[PDB]
């Protein structure tokens, strides 16, 4: 190939560092709450070349990948691919992201403590659930 | 409090077929299958014991062996004793603990604290 002048060697998206030199679909996977499959789905819904590296992009495209990523159901990523399906709180099929995941697992743990369930007590002990 | 974007008042007044859509899969399956005789009896008992109580006071505890029972929104408020093989555990049913079974409240085994080993 050639030498890209507008190359981002280091990326920062959603308070998580992304390695720009890595391949796009496997570079988004670096953030929490996004696996490979999901990334692929996003990038096929974003209409972006999959052969491209993460630093080998414009900003608008990146912003639109972000947009799609945030609000998956609106961009026709259908209701099974999402991380959290029926939430115990609001019951919204929404995919969770980087910090959100940390918040929400924590929340779950708290609720399981509160309830005094068996799983909860196991988790409090420092033991196995399954 | 809110459960799947639905409040307690709505939940209580809700259809039985509509809960077969607002639960986890297991629970939905169970409700499709139908509540067994014993379960029905338990539920009726609960209904009685919450009805025959002073308004200020917490209702009288109903003892049961059914740990295969799913907690419905109608049980929220009641105190239930659940057998764990040896002893009962008096459990106040909270709004948070509907999508669970009664079993996961009364633990059937004591947790392990290790004694120092012998001739091995």
């Amino acid at each position: 190939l050639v030498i890209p002048e507008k190359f981002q060697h280091i990326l920062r998206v959603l308070n998580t560092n992304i390695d720009g030199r890595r391949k796009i679909a496997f570079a988004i996977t670096a953030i929490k709450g996004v696996g490979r499959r999901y990334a692929h789905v996003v990038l096929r819904k974003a209409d972006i070349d999959l052969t491209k590296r993460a630093g080998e992009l414009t900003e608008d495209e990146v912003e639109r990948v972000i947009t799609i990523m945030q609000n998956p159901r609106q961009y026709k990523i259908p209701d099974w691919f999402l991380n959290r399906q029926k939430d115990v709180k609001d019951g919204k099929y929404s995919q969770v992201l980087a910090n959100g995941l940390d918040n929400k697992l924590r929340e779950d743990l708290e609720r399981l403590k509160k309830i005094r369930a068996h799983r909860g007590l196991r988790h409090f002990w420092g033991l196995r659930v399954r | 409090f809110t459960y799947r974007g639905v409040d307690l008042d709505q939940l209580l007044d809700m259809s039985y077929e509509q809960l077969m859509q607002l639960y986890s899969a297991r629970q939905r399956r169970r409700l499709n299958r139908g509540l067994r005789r014993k379960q029905h009896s338990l539920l009726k008992r609960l209904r009685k014991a919450k009805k025959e109580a002073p308004p200020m006071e917490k209702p009288e505890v109903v003892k049961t062996h059914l740990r295969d029972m799913i907690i419905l929104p109608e049980m929220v408020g009641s105190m239930v004793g659940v057998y764990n093989g040896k002893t009962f555990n008096q459990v106040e049913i909270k709004p948070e603990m509907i999508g669970h079974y009664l079993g996961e409240f009364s633990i059937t085994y004591k947790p392990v604290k290790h004694g120092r080993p012998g001739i091995g």
């Binding site: 005094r116 007590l121 002990w125 | 505890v61 105190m79 004793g81 764990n84 040896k86 002893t87 009962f88 555990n89 008096q90 459990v91 106040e92 009364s106 633990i107 004591k110 947790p111």
Partner: peptide, 14 residues
């Protein structure tokens, strides 16, 4: 410190 209704058997978990 133990909750109101819980028994001696389940107390070991708390």
């Amino acid at each position: 410190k133990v909750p109101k209704g819980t028994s001696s058997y389940q107390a070991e978990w708390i």
